[PDB]
Amino acid sequence: TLTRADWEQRAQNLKIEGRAFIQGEYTAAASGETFDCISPVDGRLLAKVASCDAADAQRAVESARSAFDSGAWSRLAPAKRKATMIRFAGLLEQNAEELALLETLDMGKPISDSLGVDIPGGARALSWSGEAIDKLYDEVAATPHDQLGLVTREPVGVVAAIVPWNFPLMMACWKLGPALSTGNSVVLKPSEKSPLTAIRIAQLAIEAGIPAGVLNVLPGYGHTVGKALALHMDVDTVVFTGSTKIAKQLMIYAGESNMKRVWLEAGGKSPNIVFADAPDLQAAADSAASAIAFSRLLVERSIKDRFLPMVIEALGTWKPGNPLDPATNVGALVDTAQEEIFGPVLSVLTFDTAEEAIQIANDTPYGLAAAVWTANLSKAHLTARALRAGSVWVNQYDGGDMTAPFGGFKQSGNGRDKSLHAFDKYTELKSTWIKL
Amino acid sequence: TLTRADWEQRAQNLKIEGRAFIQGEYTAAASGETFDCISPVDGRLLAKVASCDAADAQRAVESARSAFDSGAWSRLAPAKRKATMIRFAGLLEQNAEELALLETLDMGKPISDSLGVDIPGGARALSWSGEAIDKLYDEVAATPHDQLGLVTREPVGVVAAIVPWNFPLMMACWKLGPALSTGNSVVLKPSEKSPLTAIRIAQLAIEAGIPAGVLNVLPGYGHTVGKALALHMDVDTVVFTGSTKIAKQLMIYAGESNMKRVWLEAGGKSPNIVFADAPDLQAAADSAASASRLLVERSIKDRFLPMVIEALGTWKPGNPLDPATNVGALVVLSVLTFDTAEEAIQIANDTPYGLAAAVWTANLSKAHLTARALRAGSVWVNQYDGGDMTAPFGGFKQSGNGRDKSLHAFDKYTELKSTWIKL
Amino acid sequence: TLTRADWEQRAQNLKIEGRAFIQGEYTAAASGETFDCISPVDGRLLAKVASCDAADAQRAVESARSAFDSGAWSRLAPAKRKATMIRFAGLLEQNAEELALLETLDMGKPISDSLGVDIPGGARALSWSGEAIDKLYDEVAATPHDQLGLVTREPVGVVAAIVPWNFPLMMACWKLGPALSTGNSVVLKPSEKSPLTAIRIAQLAIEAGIPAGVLNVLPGYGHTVGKALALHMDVDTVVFTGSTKIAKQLMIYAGESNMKRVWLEAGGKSPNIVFADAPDLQAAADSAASASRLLVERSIKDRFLPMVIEALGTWKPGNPLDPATNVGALVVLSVLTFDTAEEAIQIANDTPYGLAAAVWTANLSKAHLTARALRAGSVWVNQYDGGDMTAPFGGFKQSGNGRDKSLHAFDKYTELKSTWIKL
Amino acid sequence: TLTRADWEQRAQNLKIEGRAFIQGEYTAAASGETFDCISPVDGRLLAKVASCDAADAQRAVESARSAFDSGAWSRLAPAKRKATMIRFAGLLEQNAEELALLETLDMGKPISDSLGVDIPGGARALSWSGEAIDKLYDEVAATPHDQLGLVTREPVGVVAAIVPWNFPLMMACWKLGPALSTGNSVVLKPSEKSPLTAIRIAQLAIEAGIPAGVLNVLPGYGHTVGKALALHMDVDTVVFTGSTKIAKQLMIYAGESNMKRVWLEAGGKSPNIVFADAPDLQAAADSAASAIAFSRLLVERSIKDRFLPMVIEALGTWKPGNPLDPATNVGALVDTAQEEIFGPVLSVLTFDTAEEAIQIANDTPYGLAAAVWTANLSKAHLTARALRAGSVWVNQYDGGDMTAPFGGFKQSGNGRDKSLHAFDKYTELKSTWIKL
C-alpha cells in the first residue's frame, strides 16, 4: 500500500494532459485559450486546460452526429458494444492509480476515497451498463392475428452530459455507461473545477474500441461551452447533475433552441429521520455526523438527549488532512420545541410522531435522498413510502448498488441515474405496427 | 340510426353547460368573465363559457393538492381505482350521443366521426388504463441477502393537462386515463376552441366516484389560464399536445417556475413511403389521400398518382350534423420520387419533426429495415394510422417527448423511488 | 338479505342440470350411465350426473382440438377475448345466488361463504385474467442490426383442468381464467363430490360468447374420465389441484402417454409462527384457530394458547343453508415452542410440503428474514390467507409446481417461441 | 494456427482425468468400478472413467444439499456470483485448447468445431448467465396502501443436470450457467459417451471460486447413476436434454419418487420450408445440405427442379475426415406428388401452398426447431407464427444469440434453455404479503 510519500512522488512525476478531445484526437480550443487548473492540495499548477466555447461545441457535435450516422457505434451489435464497454471499464481499473491521483489533485478528494471508491465505482458503472446491453428486451404488443406490433427503444443520437466537480469521474461514468451502451454519441463537459479525469479517459475510450467521434470531451466553463451545448440545435438530449438554478436554466435553453430532452439531477436538502426504536443508534449517529462533514437531521424527542452526544463524538472522527495522505478522510484544501442549533454546527429538528417527521421532511423544494432509522416493520415501510425522495435508505445511509436508480422528486430533478431505468433517458420509444 | 334531422333536433334541444369545475362543483371564473363558444356548424351561440385566469388556476391547484394529500384517490386501493375508471368510461358510453353532439357542434367534426371514433376512443382510453392499474408490477432489485431493494413508482401529485381542439375529448382521455389511474389529481385545460366536452365529463367523473378536487376543469385561453398552470409553483407535471411554438414555451415556463416535468407532443407529419412492391396500391393511395409529403418509387409513380387523385375526390365537405358527412364544411400534397430505399429514408428523415410515417412494401427486409431507419415515434407498415391502446404514441425530435397510450403512458405520471432496506 | 327459510325455498325450487357439456350442448355420457349427486346438507338427491369415461374424454378432446384449430377463440383478437371473459364473469355475478346455492347444496359449504367469497372470487378470477390479456407484452431480443429476434408466447392448445371439491367454482375459475384468456380450449373435470357448478357455468360461457368446443365439461370419477384425460395423447397440458398421491400419478400418466406438461398444486399446511412481538396477538390467535402446526415463542405461550382456545370456540357447525352458519354440519392442532427465529425456521421447514405460512412479528428484520428463509409458495406477514389476484399461489417441494393467479398463472398455459429473422 | 500434427502431439501428451468429482475433490466411484472411455478418432483408450451408481448419487446429493444449506453459494451476493461465474467462463477460455481436444477425442467432433464453436459457446453461456444475475428484477404487486406484496424468485436447491453427447461441454454449460447463477447446487451427469470435459471443468469451477459441493460431477451410465438422480428423494429439479423415450421415463421417475420438477428438451424432426420467393436460394440449399449431414425438407413445387440440384452439390462439401485435422468438417469416426426419396439420402416433400407446408410441417410429435425461407413479409411472419416449434429461423438456419430460449413444443420438450427465461427452470416463485 502506497504511503503519502509515494503519492507525493507520483504526483510530481505525472505528465498531465489538458487538451480537449474531438474526433479521436486531443486538440486545443479553437481560440487557443486555456484556463489554469490549480490543485487545491497545495496550489500547484496542474495543467493549462483548453477553454472550449461555442465553436468547439459545434465541432464536437458535428463529430458526434457524423459518428452516430455512420453506425460505427450506433448500429454495432449489442454483444460487441458490451465487450467494448467492459474493456473500457477494465482500462479505468488498469490506470486506477493515475486516475485516482488526477482526481485527488484536481479537486482535493482524499486519495483513499479516489482510489477506493470513485475510480472503482466509475469502472463499475461502465461495466455494469455494458453487461446489461444484451439483457434488455423491447416489447411485442398484444394485437389481432393479422398485426405485428413492436415497441422498441433506439438511441436518441447526440447526448450532452454536463457534470459537477464533487465526483468528477464517477458522475461522468454514471452518464457515460448507459448513454454509450445504448449507442449514442456523447459530448462530455466536465466541471471547470475538475476537468482532468474526463480529459484522461477520453483516450482510454479509443483504446477500448470506442470509435472516433463517439465520445468527445470539452473542458471549459459552464457559461461558455456548457450553455453552447444546451442551446445547440443538433443535440438531442442533455443530461445534467448540479444546482437547481442551472437545472432550471437548461430547461429555458432547451425551449429557446430545439426542444431537446432535458434530464436533471439537482441536490436539495436530504432528511435523516432517527426514531427512538432505531436498531443501531450508533450507526444512525455515524450517519448524521457523516452528513454534517463531507442534509437535515430529524430526531424523535424520547431519544434526543441520548442521541445528540453520539453525533457530536462521531463528528470528531472527521478531521481535515492532506488529501495525498492515505489516512486522510476529509480533504484539507487550499485557495486556488422543534428546531434548534445545538453546537457551532449541529442543527436539529425534534418531533414526537412519525406524521410530524414526514411532514417536516417533505416540507422542502425536495428531496434527492432520505434515510429512516426504525426497527418497526410498519413504520419503516409506511414512512419510506410517505417520503418524497428519489432514494430512501432504511437503517443504513448511502446504500445502493448499481441496481439503484438515483434521482429526485420535484426540484431535486427528473429521471434517474443508475439501474436499468437509467437507459430510458438515452433512448426513444418507437411503435412499429405491421399489417400482415 | 339517427338522421340529420334527428341530430338537428337534438342539437336544438341541448342545455349546454359552460362553467368551470372545481372541487366537485361547477363554478364561474373568479372574475365572472366568459367567452362566447360559437359553433362552426352554424354560427349559433352554444354557451357563454367561463374564461378562467391565474386566480382560478390557483384555486384549482389548491383543490387538486388537498385532494391528493387526502389520499381519497391517491391512496385508494388499485382495484377500486380500476373499477371507478371503468365506470367513468361507462358513463361516457352511456352519454355518447350527447358527448358526440357537443364535440361536433363545438368544433365541427362530422357527427359520424364524433359518435363512431372519438367518444368510443376516449372511453376506451379510460377503461383500458383502468384495467391496467392492478396489472402493473414494480421491481425488487437483486441485492445481498441482508438487503431489500425496492424500485417503485408513485404519482407525481398535481398534473396539468393542456389539450388542443382537433380531438377534444379523446385527447383529453388519453391524458386523463393514465394520469387519474395512477392516482394523480388533474387540472384539465381544454382548448378555447373546444371546451364543451371537457366541461361536461367533469360531472361524469364525480358520478363515477372520482373524488371532489381530483379532476378540475378550467376553460379559458392558453395565454391566461394555460400560461398560469405552466408557471404554477405547485404543479408537478404538465402534459401537452399542440404546436411546437407553445411546446417550447412550456419548457421555458417550467424553467422560470418550479422545474416541473414537461411532456410534449408537438406538430408532426405523416409521410407515406410507397414502394413499387406495395401489396395493395389502392390502400396506399387512400392513405396518401387522407390528408404533407408523399414519397413514391419512380417505377410506379405514373400509375399511382392517378389513384391518389381519384381517392382525394371521395372526401366531400358537408353539414357536420349529417351522418353522411366525412369532412366538416365549417363557419397541398408534395410528391417526391425515389429510386432506392436509401434515398427514401434520407428524404423522409430530412425534417425537424418526427411524429409518424407509413411504409408500403411486401418485402420482409425492406419493411423492417426501413421502419428501423425512420426517425418517427410511430411507423405503420402496409396500413396507416394503425395501432390501438397497446401502442404508445408520440414523437422524435421536435414532435415532442413521452408517449400517450400503452403501459408507457403511465411513466409520465409517476416518479421512481429506490428504497434500500438494511436487514 | 335472504333468510334460511328463503334459501330452503330456493333450494327446493331449483331445476338442477346434471349432464356433461361437449361442443356447445349438454349431453349424456356415451354409456348413458350416471352417478347420484347427494347433498351433504340433507341427503336429498340433487341430480343424476353424467358419469363420463374414456369415450367422452375422446369426444371432448376432439371437440377441443377442432375448436382450437378453427381459431374462433385461439386467434380471436386479444381485446375481444378480454370482453368475452369479462361478460363471462358478469354472468357468474348475474347468476350468483343460483351458483352459490348449487355450491352449498353440492358439497356443504355455508351459504354465506358460497355467496360472499367463492362466487365473487371465481368471477373475479375470470374478469381479472380477461382484463390482463391485452396488457401483456412479449419480447424483442437485443440483436445485431440485420436481425429481428422475437420471443413470444402461444397457447399450448388443449388443456385438461382437474379440480377438487373444496372450492369447486373458484378453483375452476382459477384455472379457466388464465387458460381461456390465453386462447386455449379447456376440458374441465370437476370432482365427483361437487360437479354441479362446473356443469352450470358451461352454458354461461356460451352465453358470454365462448365458442362451442372451447370449454367442455366432463363430470365423472377421477379413475375413469380423469385418468383418461391425463393419459390422452392429444391433451397438451394438464393442470391439477388435489392430493399429493394423485399429483404424482399424473406425472406417471404423462410419462406413459405423450409427455404432456403437468402443473400440480398438491397438499400443504399453513403453519403459524407467532413471535412475542407480534403487533396483534388476537389476530394471530384467530388465524391459528381457523384450522396443523402452531409455532409459538416460549415467552408468550402461556398467554397465547388460551387466546387460540377461545377463538376455536367461535366456530359453530350448523345448517349450511342458514346465513349465520360458518361451518357446515354435513351428512388436532400441534403446539411447538421455540426460543429463537432460527429454531422456528428449522421447525417450520421440517416438512415434505411447502404451500403457505403465516409469520407474526412487528420487527422489520425478523419479518423479512424469516419470510425469506421459509420454503413456502406463500408467506403472509401479520395477517393470514392474504393476497388477491395479483399474488401467485402455489407450492414448493411436494405441494406442487406452478402458480395460480397473478400474471405468472398465464405461463402454465403458453409455450415460448423464439423467432430469429435474418434481414 | 495448429496443424493436424500439432494436435496429434498434444493428444498423445495429455494426461486425462477420469474420476468423479464430489465435495471439491476427484474421487473414484464407491464401488471402485470404471468404464473404458474409448476415442472414436482412432480407438485409443483415453481413460478409465469412474462408473458411478446410486451410492455416488447419494453422496453427491448430500454434498449438494449441505452446500446449498450453508449459503456459501446460495446466499452469496449476486454481484459476487456474477464475478465468480465470469471467472469460471474465463478459465474455460484459458484452457480452451485442452478442452477442445478432450471433446474431439471423446466423441469425434472436428477439432475446428470444438475449438471454434463449442468451447467458446460454453464459456459464453457461463459468462452471459453471470452477467445477467444482477440485472434481474423480481416484482412488487399493486396492492392497497396497507399491504406490501412481493413476488420473488429463489433457487430450487439441488438440481440434477443430465446431458447428451452431441455437444457435451456446450450443453452442460447451457444448464450450468443459469442453474449456478441463480444459486443452486448442481449434480451434473454427462453422457457415458462423452464424460471427459464435464470431469475436467469440475476443477475449473473450484479454481473460479465455486464452493466445494456446489458443482459435483458423476460420470457413468444413464440406467445406473442417471436413474438414481431422477429417483432421488432430495433432488428438487432434474433438467434433461436427449431422447423422447428417456424424457418420458424421467416424468415417471419423478412421479414415483418426490414429485421433483422435470424440464425436458427432446429432439424431434425439425422442418425446413423453402418457398419459391426465398431471397437467397443458395443459402437455403446450404442449409438443407447441412441438415442431412451433421430434419425434414419441404420445398415449393415451382422451385423444386431448380433447388434440389443445389442441395445435392452443396452436400458434396461435407466430407468425413480425421477429427484432429483442422480442415475436417465432418468427423470420420471409428468403432469403440408430395413425398419422394430422390438420391440415396435425399428425402423431399413438395407443396403448392403455405397452408400445405404448415400442415405437413406440424404433422409431427414435433418440433424443436424450424426454418422458413421467403422474402415476403406477410408469409414469413404468418408461417413462423403457425409453426409449432420452440425455435423458428427465417431466411437463415441455426441462428440464435444467448438471448434465444431454445426448447420445444409438445413431445419435443418443456421449458427453454438459454435467455432470461432459462433462469425460471432453476427458481421457485414465492409470494410474501405483508400487512402494514
Numbering used by the authors:
A (entry chain A), D (entry chain A): 3 to 296, 306 to 347, 398 to 497
B (entry chain B), C (entry chain B): 3 to 293, 306 to 345, 406 to 497
What do the authors say?
The x-ray crystal structures of AldA in the apoenzyme, NAD+ complex, and NAD+•IAA complex forms were determined. Comparison of the AldA crystal structures suggests that ligand binding results in structural changes that order the active site. Likewise, a ~50 amino acid region of the catalytic domain (residues 348–397; α13-β15-β16-α15-β17-β19) is disordered in the apoenzyme structure and displays elevated B-factors in ligand bound structures.
Here, we demonstrate that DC3000 produces IAA and identify an indole-3-acetaldehyde dehydrogenase, AldA, that catalyzes the NAD-dependent formation of IAA from indole-3-acetaldehyde (IAAld). Overall, the biochemical and structural data presented here indicate that in P. syringae strain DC3000 AldA functions as an IAAld dehydrogenase in IAA biosynthesis.
